[PDB]
């Protein structure tokens, strides 16, 4: 059947960062891991590859550079068989790689588990993190092993699938894209201690103390003028409709200044009560 790729938190950040240099510029790298077909698939560690005159292509793979890396990657035990390659391209509706077309056919002969990954956004990520891979089916999808038994497959309904330009056939021969991410026990505690939403730690005692009470130099300074700002914001919209009917043609006008000055006041009170609430023990 097909293969479900499972990129961990370590491989996703490394494969992405290698292709973040330039919109037009294209690079490539090598993926390594140890797994078995029949669903499961892992990636241990990756590293970028040098760019040749052809850019991203089948001849851009250096057997001399690749052999030297596998010897240097043996010291830590991360040396494994070649599970595929990852590339970098600006991306399109179909065939995101502007060069590679049949290059995967030469890759399938070396390893049947090898894939070609292309990063569409190139620092355009809005938080979705959508990456594209490729696998050559060649002759298939008729009276053979049934791929779409795993997850999110048999797509192509009407003209809208994914980017909506691929529809059914996707890139070539309906490679049935499947991507999932996982986090181990070490990746769970490390990422939450480094980046979760925003990292304020290491300042933990001064976290909100220095950012607010010690930042009062100019932050909320002249609170009497800061309260005057909330006056002009409320007086503007409250003046609109005092008759509770249609006059100036508005709806949320009374709710506009409601939510804006509510969070500001909530921050004004918490910072002020914690000024003397830290209790630095000044005494005399």
């Amino acid at each position: 059947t097909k293969e479900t790729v499972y990129i961990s938190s370590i491989a996703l950040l490394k494969m992405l960062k290698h292709g973040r240099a330039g919109v037009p510029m294209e690079v490539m790298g090598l993926m390594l891991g140890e797994f078995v077909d029949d669903y499961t698939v892992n990636v241990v560690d990756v590293f970028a590859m040098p760019q040749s005159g052809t850019g991203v292509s089948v001849e851009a793979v250096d057997d001399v550079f690749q052999a030297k890396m596998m010897d240097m990657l043996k010291q830590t035990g991360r040396d494994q068989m070649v599970v595929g390659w990852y590339h970098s391209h600006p991306g399109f509706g179909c065939w995101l790689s502007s060069v590679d077309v049949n290059t995967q056919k030469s890759f399938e002969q070396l390893n049947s588990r090898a894939v070609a990954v292309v990063v569409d956004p190139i620092q355009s990520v809005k938080g979705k993190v959508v990456i594209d891979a490729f696998r050559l089916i060649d002759t298939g999808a008729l009276i053979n092993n049934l791929e779409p038994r795993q997850t999110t497959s048999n797509t192509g309904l009407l003209n809208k699938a994914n980017i909506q330009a691929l529809i059914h056939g996707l890139n070539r021969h309906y490679y049935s894209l499947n991507i999932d991410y996982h986090k181990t026990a070490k990746e769970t505690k490390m990422l939450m201690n480094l980046h979760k939403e925003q990292w304020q730690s290491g300042l933990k005692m001064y976290d909100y103390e220095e950012k607010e009470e010690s930042n009062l130099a100019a932050t909320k300074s002249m609170v009497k003028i800061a309260e005057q700002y909330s006056k002009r914001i409320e007086e503007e919209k409250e003046l609109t409709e005092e008759e509770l009917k249609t006059r100036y043609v508005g709806r949320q006008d009374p709710k506009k200044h409601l939510s804006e000055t509510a969070d500001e006041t909530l921050e004004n009170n918490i910072v002020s009560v914690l000024t003397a609430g830290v209790n630095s023990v000044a005494i005399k």
């Binding site: 938190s9 370590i10 950040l13 490394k14 992405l16 960062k17 290698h18 973040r20 560690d45 590293f47 590859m49 040098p50 550079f65 030297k68 240097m72 010291q75 830590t76 035990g77 620092q123 990520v125 809005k126 938080g127 979705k128 993190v129 991410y181 070490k186 505690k189 490390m190 990422l191 939450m192 201690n193 480094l194 980046h195 979760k196 939403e197 730690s201 290491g202 933990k204 005692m205 976290d207 909100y208 103390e209 609170v223 309260e227 409320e234 509770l244 009374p254 709710k255 409601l258 000055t261 006041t265 909530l266 004004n268 009170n269 918490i270 002020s272 009560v273 914690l274 000024t275 609430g277």
Partner: protein
């Protein structure tokens, strides 16, 4: 002094290398950091672990291979030309004769001062599993540098997809005071003056505070002024619901 900014990808990949080698407590892992040390803020954009062998019972037993450094440095030239060796990291809480003697070994391939890093694989206490340390002589003296966690635009966004106020600061501030109480006790039994000289200096930093009592009430005065505005927030909700109530009473009539 200087500053150190370590990306979360460097610390995430450094912990798994400890598991990939199956290193127990009797041994520690050592690796090299890559980045730009020319500026005042040292940044690590790359790292790789090294097969470091050590005996815990003997501080004179260590194994560091320099041949893998020369080959790895030449391989990175075909990857990123802006990445150079700014120093070396290591694991384990303890600093012994193994880590001190190898500090000058990486100095041959590092132009600036190699940045020392103590990596905690178990993540014991507070934050910052890895602390930034710089080597300086007056005996080897390792001074701590501020360690901040900052990444690129797509790096911070990519991690959020993987994981996809007042009481918080107070609980974190009380833990710092408790760490200071044990700091003076553990240091007192060690002597029986250098650190105490800096502590007694910042302790002193109502004759002049007689007029400083009013400033506490001046901020509390604005809080009630803010509560007056905070009350207006719900005064409109008091009006907003009657906007529905007049339409609510017009429903049963139409039914």
């Amino acid at each position: 002094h200087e500053k150190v900014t370590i990306a979360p990808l460097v610390l995430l990949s450094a912990l798994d290398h400890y598991e990939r080698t199956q290193t127990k407590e009797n041994k520690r892992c050592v690796g090299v950091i890559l980045g730009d040390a020319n500026s005042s803020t040292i940044r690590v954009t790359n790292s790789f672990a090294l097969p470091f062998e050590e005996d815990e019972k003997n501080s004179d037993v260590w194994f560091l291979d320099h041949n893998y450094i020369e080959n790895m440095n030449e391989m990175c030239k075909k990857i990123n030309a802006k990445e150079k060796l700014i120093g070396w990291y290591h694991s384990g809480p303890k600093l012994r004769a193994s880590d001190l003697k190898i500090n000058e070994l990486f100095k041959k391939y590092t132009q600036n001062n190699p940045l020392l890093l103590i990596v905690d694989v178990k993540q014991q206490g507070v934050g910052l599993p890895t602390d930034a340390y710089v080597a300086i002589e007056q005996e080897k003296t390792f001074l701590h540098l501020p360690c901040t966690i900052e990444a690129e635009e797509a790096e911070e966004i990519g991690v959020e997809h993987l994981l996809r106020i007042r009481l918080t600061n107070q609980l974190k501030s009380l833990k710092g005071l408790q760490s200071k109480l044990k700091d003076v006790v553990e240091y007192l039994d060690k002597v029986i003056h250098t650190i105490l000289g800096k502590l007694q200096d910042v302790f002193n930093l109502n004759n002049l505070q007689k007029a400083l009592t009013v400033k506490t009430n001046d901020e509390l005065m604005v809080i009630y002024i803010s509560n007056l505005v905070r009350s207006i927030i719900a005064f409109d909700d008091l009006i907003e619901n009657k906007i529905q109530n007049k339409k609510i009473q017009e429903q049963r009539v139409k039914d």
